[PDB]
Design a protein around this nucleic acid. Structure first.
Ligand SMILES: C[S@@+](CC[C@H](N)C(=O)[O-])C[C@H]1O[C@@H](n2cnc3c(N)ncnc32)[C@H](O)[C@@H]1O
Ligand SMILES: C[S@@+](CC[C@H](N)C(=O)[O-])C[C@H]1O[C@@H](n2cnc3c(N)ncnc32)[C@H](O)[C@@H]1O
Lengths: 88, 95, 75, 99, 109, 329, 329, 88, 99, 95, 109, 75
DNA sequence: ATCGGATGTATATATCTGACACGTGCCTGGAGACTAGGGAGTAATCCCCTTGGCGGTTAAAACGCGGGGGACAGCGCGTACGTGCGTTTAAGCGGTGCTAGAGCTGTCTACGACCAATTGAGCGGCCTCGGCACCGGGATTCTCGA
DNA sequence: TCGAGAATCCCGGTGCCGAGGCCGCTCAATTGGTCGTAGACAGCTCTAGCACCGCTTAAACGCACGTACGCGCTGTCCCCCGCGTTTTAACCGCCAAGGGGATTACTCCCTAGTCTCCAGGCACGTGTCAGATATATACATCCGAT
């Protein structure tokens, strides 16, 4: 049969331009240059990689296989991004 | 038939029924208040631990807690916080 | 016995009681009509502090008397 | 002969509409797939309890909203209204992440 | 054996002095824990929680609501300038932001 | 072994000065001392300077023998001439005139210079203790004496009186009944017992009257002081470095003060924005109103920037109004 | 119960197919399988399609009985006609022709589709263990086979051979002596013993020859493998998830390799910028040169982005040059 | 005699304009507006007050009277301003 | 008829001269007095071991040099060369101290 | 006749005489290296302490130290650091 | 009793494994300390110190000097982009800054 | 006995020794002229590994012989 | 400035659902009473180091003048971003089924704390010489006005 | 496009003080045993994470139009830089005092550890009302027009 692990790719294009523009409006921005939408996807991918890497380090120390919400809360607290409301 | 998992929910609720006797709290906001209390607990207790290692003592006392509060909290919160703690410890020893 | 309770703000409340009533009841009566907890009320009349164990007749408080209400701090 | 608002008033309307609410502003399934395919770079396979993906989305939204709040100050400093990539790059450097 | 009396009641507190003593004792902070340390720490924690819940309740009331939700905790924290320094690096989930527009962006008259 | 004596405008009282004058700071000594008290009397009565700018000019020699005895001879028999001006049916201006601001300031600084010998000893205390020493200026005390308006049926107590200059100023500027100062430490108290003597001496030398006061040594946290604190009208306490344990006890003693009693303090015994709910009904801030005084500069002795002094007033009407608006719904 | 048989261009060997064909993914099954292997033979020899585009056109019906037996009847007796074309003094093209890239890729994917039944079972391992499964693509193996240039006097070992597709590709594309694969886990090894059979079968069916190899089950950290690792020319190891404890041991086993021995690895056994001083003289990076291969995309099986593969070469001249430039001063 | 504690005042004017301009040059600044020299003294006074307040809190906990260099190193470390070289 | 450099070359000379050295750039006695009279706001009297005043000066210098390094980026962002107070105020806000 | 105050000076010097056999260190730079070692010690040991409280263990082991190193150090320092620690622990147990 | 042998020598280390074990044990980190924890931690500390001292020595050599001073530690740290992240918030005393001028400030040609 | 030591880089060093010298001395001699620590040197000749306890005469190494020098890793 | 039309936002009313607040039973952790040992509190001694004052030399700060370059306002052009509309894509919601893996319980063995004896590693104290700083003199580079 | 002149580098010469190495002596690390609890492992259960399907509709997408805004250019002017003269107070070397930080010897009381016991707080159920959703209407803001 066909190979294991159906692979996913270029999912950053799911952070679409209207979504980036809603986030800009909540940040209080009135007019958006058209080259912002790629700089923003770069910034987001870097942030997410840095957090998920630590969440997985925590989840591997505990010898398990699912990333819990405490792994994310600890990975965030370790970078100064404390988060209230998910079981801290 | 689960294990017992404890929290500050009932003490947060007792304090709320004193400040605002006719207000309630949603479950998601009780989660936030619960993580807030743990966060400030660990900040103060870790600062007091450090403060006692510096001086080569091996006891966390009510002086370490007072000094850690004065180091961590901002200007006008810290005054009222130490005046609450002092009143509590006094009412305790005179009993 | 009809009595008047004078507050420090120039407010007077009128109450209806009998000399046979207990002090617990009188303090509850003040609480009942104005909401002040009994433990904060200190009553002084003709330079006497009212004592928990005395009765109204003990202090010789007669009809149309006026009482003074001083408010205290809790503890 | 339709009616049409002038450029810049619907924007100020969306500002208020989105600063009044608290919902999440990214679609949920696209974001979940993004998280799930960032976590493929670890050869083993993982499972992502669902509150984990929710926590990740909350922190990710709250990071970008404040980055845009700084980008705006940088753009207004240059006597502009439009935000451009060279404002993101200055916010992220002064803030202490790019250098 | 006399009648039990929690240590919170002798202090005049609503927060659990015995549970705080245990969490300090089992938490690897020092070799020993004093007697007034849990009383002091519990009184401080209770003061701070009352201080936040009062402002959260005010914000809930002037939205014409009788329950506190995370938006009211957020508004209470960010509108007070000393709680905003204690919680300057936390993120309250489902809390939104403060309404704020720059004055160069508003339309001219 | 001779003198630099001078003569009393009111009464017949001698002042004494040894020829080796005391040592003070950069440029300060008994020279400006004497020339200025002469200047203040010449401003006090006009006939004196109308006799005391004839014959003379403005400056004089500070280190010389004969210039100071020039001033003493001139002043002494010129005052004898004034005495002969008043020998007739004439009567001088009143004895009970409360001294003016400038005259009083000269008096208090004169007393302080004479009695306190070694001021650096006042710095012998324990660090960060309640016993630290710090002093209030003349201008802040004046502001407070004018802000509170003490009638003749008020009692003024000064907790931690230090050397005593606050009580001396208030006793000389106010018309009250009696004034008390209590001071626990040893070194300031030993100077207070000298300040008392020297103030009475110089005051009756000038011929101005004051209220009556007492500078005692004690402990305001004693069993004997609880009911003296409760039986007092206005209280001055400099609780800047008392810390939260002594301030808690003073709060427990201020609860029993009578209505309209006022306190002034370096730090407030109650927040300036004290709300009130079912949870702080034991706090003393629930029966008092706090107002911050205007921060004039040079207010304290330990720093150069200005500090404010927080007048409190006891008024139990706020508690009953809260209780009475509680029954509205 | 009937067939979908076809006939061997070289040799006389039958292929078998049950009428209910296997189930694969979204759009993939034995239909494209058979039509494409026919296409590859028609590209293999031109006379076949010159006989196999006459009479016919391009598309055919996948689900129908008679369209597949149309293709089988046509192909089988058209190949018999080809056999009669070659009945004379003519001789077909060589048997030992190493299969081209496209033909080989079809062969390996054919073998993998047939043998591995339930690929999701390959995911039954322990998390973050050395036993995790992950597979290398065809294009990366090709790049490596062309980067290293194996002569006919080299031995190739593949540590952790997985199912075996790497060794099969290298054994069919290189002219070496022997090829080994060792695999510890149970589930991949049980499929490897089928891959071996099916590869030999399909290869001699097409009529192309390969080197000789062996897909054993073992443990490359054993006592029996230390001197087989030391007696090897080129080593392929996918040590992405082996962790630092197994990599330390493999470093201790690679020290005894002969000069000019080469390794390729997912992660480098030595930094790309390894300096050398008196402190790391025990490190294995002091006797080898590391070069990063070009990161073509689609290189691995677990992610979509490209990964690089770090060719190492054993060369002890760097250590002696350091020692010999040490005596210069 | 004269009062205790000879008081000091307006010593911020000792952070003089040439000193502020040397610090700007080390920071890489080519041209300085003339209103910078007061904004800078404000920034410096705030920084110093925040550090010295904690240094004195540490020195009072230990029941002593001189501020040591470890008090300053701890007060700085508590604000994220770690300092190497003074006995940490 | 003297010789005189053009405005902006002696500045670029001082840049290099001060980015090459490691000395302290504030006078020592004025700074010590500043520290000593900030510490007067605590009623008690203190004594300041001398390495303490040195540590304070090191941290104070290193704070201002980096604040100026951010002020410069803000000024160059506005297409300027001169640094002005509104650049200090933006650096300190984006950086997370003023708000 | 003072008390004994210890530091890492001699081990810093032994390591320097291996990397650069003909270089010395000034006293002020030895102070900096001394505070650097203590700083990184406390970072790693505190992270490992925390990591062991999360999992409800009461032992700091060589797995906590490895994971704390992988959490704290940047990308390419951490690889070489764990490969140094692994070699040390191996040379130790095989002895 | 056999011949003593420090625990550093069995590991092949220059840093003190026994002193690290003691500092972990007396430092309120956990109830118990393993056997390989001090060996691992001492090997890591030594690796990092060698990594810094090598670059500091290079910088000292190309200033034509034979001793390391704080300026060379500073240059070594700030010029390496992964030590600059570990020490991104520390201040090395008497260390100066990196030479760096913006290209819009240099004179035009 | 004169001997030659051939390295893997095509370098040959000539040494002067006598059969009565110890192995410790020979390893020291290689160290002495090229700086290579003795513990990293592995000498192989005519398919024999030289053993610490043998002498040069033990292996029958005669004048004008050539030795092979292989370099090893430390531990 | 004022006016009118059309659009978007707020306000009042009904209904309904699911989450909050409250009550019950039980069990495990907190309080009570008590004993033993060591940490901290206190008194006394010593000596290092912080503070204060003095004089002299010179480096750095302060002040003022001249001019040029850079900040800032105004104006014009042209492209790129906002608004609205019709079309197309997949998110969201619900409902179902599966089975893996997280969580818990019961044993048992190895590993780490504790202890007593002992000896060498590392610290403080003490010299000695060489690396580096300071200085003078020549060469070179770079800037600016020709 | 190039000379004059100021600033920076580079090459020896002298001196000094701090790095480096050696000694003697405690005291902390190592060795050798013993014990008891943490954690490793096997087995079981049952919750929740994954995968699939269909349907409805909300949100994304692509496109056309015009206008506000970004950006370049030009002109004025004033403010900041480079330099020279004068004035101030930092720095350095020295001396003297005495305070307070650091150490040592005792003693006592406050905290850990233990055993018993009982009530506070957690999980589980259950009812009702606060808030969301939908509709009808008032009105407040925007834009074109006068
Ligand atoms: C800060 S001084 C104020 C001096 C004086 N009030 C003035 O303003 O000039 C406070 C004085 O209160 C004294 N003091 C402190 N605690 C005291 C106490 N518990 N009982 C009596 N006096 C006390 C101390 O001796 C100290 O001298
Ligand atoms: C990552 S897979 C590589 C698959 C194969 N090399 C490929 O590229 O297609 C590595 C395999 O090595 C095997 N393996 C892991 N440790 C091993 C060991 N110690 N001895 C033998 N095989 C091992 C595991 O079973 C795993 O399947």
């Amino acid at each position: 049969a066909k190979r294991h692990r159906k692979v996913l790719r270029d999912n950053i294009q799911g952070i679409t331009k209207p979504a980036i523009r809603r986030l800009a409006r909540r940040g209080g921005v009135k007019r958006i240059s058209g080259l912002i939408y790629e700089e923003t996807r770069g910034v987001l991918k870097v942030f997410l990689e840095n957090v998920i890497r630590d969440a997985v380090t925590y989840t591997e120390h505990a010898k398990r296989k699912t990333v819990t919400a405490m792994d994310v809360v600890y990975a965030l607290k370790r970078q100064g991004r404390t988060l209230y409301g998910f079981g801290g | 038939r689960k294990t017992r998992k404890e929290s500050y929910a009932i003490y947060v609720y007792k304090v709320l029924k004193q400040v605002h006797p006719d207000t309630g709290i949603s479950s998601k906001a009780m989660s936030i208040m619960n993580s807030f209390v743990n966060d400030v607990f660990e900040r103060i207790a870790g600062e007091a631990s450090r403060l006692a290692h510096y001086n080569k003592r091996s006891t966390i006392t009510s002086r370490e807690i007072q000094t850690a509060v004065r180091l961590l909290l901002p200007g006008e919160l810290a005054k009222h916080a130490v005046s609450e703690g002092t009143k509590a410890v006094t009412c305790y020893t005179s009993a | 016995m009809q009595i008047f309770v004078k507050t420090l703000t120039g407010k007077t409340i009128t109450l209806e009681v009998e000399p046979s009533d207990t002090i617990e009841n009188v303090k509850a009566k003040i609480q009942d009509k104005e909401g002040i907890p009994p433990d904060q009320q200190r009553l002084i009349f003709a330079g006497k502090q009212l004592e928990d164990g005395r009765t109204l007749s003990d202090y010789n408080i007669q009809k149309e008397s006026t009482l003074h209400l001083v408010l205290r701090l809790r503890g | 002969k339709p009616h049409r608002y002038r450029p810049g008033t619907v924007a100020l309307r969306e500002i208020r509409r989105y600063q009044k609410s608290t919902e999440l502003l990214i679609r949920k399934l696209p974001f979940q797939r993004l998280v799930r395919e960032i976590a493929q770079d670890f050869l083993t396979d993982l499972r992502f309890q669902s509150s984990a993906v929710l926590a990740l989305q909350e922190a990710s939204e709250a990071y970008l909203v404040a980055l845009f709040e700084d980008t705006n100050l940088c753009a207004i400093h240059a006597k502009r209204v439009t935000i451009l990539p060279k404002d993101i790059q200055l916010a992220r450097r002064i803030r202490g992440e790019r250098a | 054996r006399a009648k039990a009396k929690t240590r919170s009641s002798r202090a005049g507190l609503q927060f659990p002095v015995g549970r705080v003593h245990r969490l300090l004792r089992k938490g690897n902070y020092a070799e020993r824990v004093g007697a007034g340390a849990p009383v002091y720490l519990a009184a401080v924690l209770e003061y701070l929680t009352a201080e936040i819940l009062e402002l959260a309740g005010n914000a809930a009331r002037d939205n014409k609501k009788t329950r506190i939700i995370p938006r009211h905790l957020q508004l209470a924290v960010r509108n007070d300038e000393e709680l905003n320094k204690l919680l300057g690096r936390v993120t309250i989930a489902q809390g939104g932001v403060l309404p704020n527009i720059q004055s160069v962006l508003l339309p001219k008259k | 072994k001779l003198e630099l004596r001078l003569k009393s405008p009111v009464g017949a009282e001698p002042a004494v000065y040894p020829w080796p004058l005391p040592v003070y700071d950069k440029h300060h000594d008994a020279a400006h001392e004497i020339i200025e008290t002469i200047r203040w009397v010449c401003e006090e009565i006009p006939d004196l300077k109308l006799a005391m700018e004839n014959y003379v000019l403005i400056d004089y020699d500070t280190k010389s023998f004969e210039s100071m005895q020039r001033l003493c001879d001139k002043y002494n028999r010129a005052i004898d001439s004034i005495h002969q001006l008043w020998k007739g049916t004439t009567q001088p201006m009143k004895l009970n005139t409360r001294p003016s601001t400038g005259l009083l300031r000269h008096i208090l600084q004169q007393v302080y210079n004479h009695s306190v010998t070694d001021p650096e000893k006042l710095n012998n205390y324990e660090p960060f203790s309640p016993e630290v020493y710090g002093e209030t200026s003349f201008d802040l005390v004046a502001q407070m004496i004018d802000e509170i308006k003490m009638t003749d049926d008020d009692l003024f107590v000064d907790l931690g009186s230090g050397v005593g200059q606050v009580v001396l100023q208030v006793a000389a500027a106010t018309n009250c009944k009696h004034h008390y100062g209590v001071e626990k430490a040893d070194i300031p108290a030993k100077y207070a017992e000298t300040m008392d003597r020297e103030f009475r001496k110089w005051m009756k030398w000038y011929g101005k009257k004051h209220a009556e006061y007492t500078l005692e040594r004690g402990d305001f946290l004693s069993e004997e002081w609880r009911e003296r604190i409760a039986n007092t009208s206005v209280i001055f306490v400099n609780n800047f470095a008392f810390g939260p344990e002594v301030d808690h006890q003073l709060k427990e003693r201020f609860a029993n003060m009578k209505e309209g009693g006022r306190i002034v303090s370096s730090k407030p015994f109650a927040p300036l924005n004290f709300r009130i709910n079912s949870r702080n009904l034991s706090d003393i801030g629930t029966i008092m109103r706090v107002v911050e005084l205007s921060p004039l500069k040079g207010s304290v002795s330990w720093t150069g920037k200005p500090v404010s002094y927080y007048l409190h007033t006891i008024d139990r009407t706020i508690l009953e109004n809260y209780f009475s608006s509680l029954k509205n719904p």
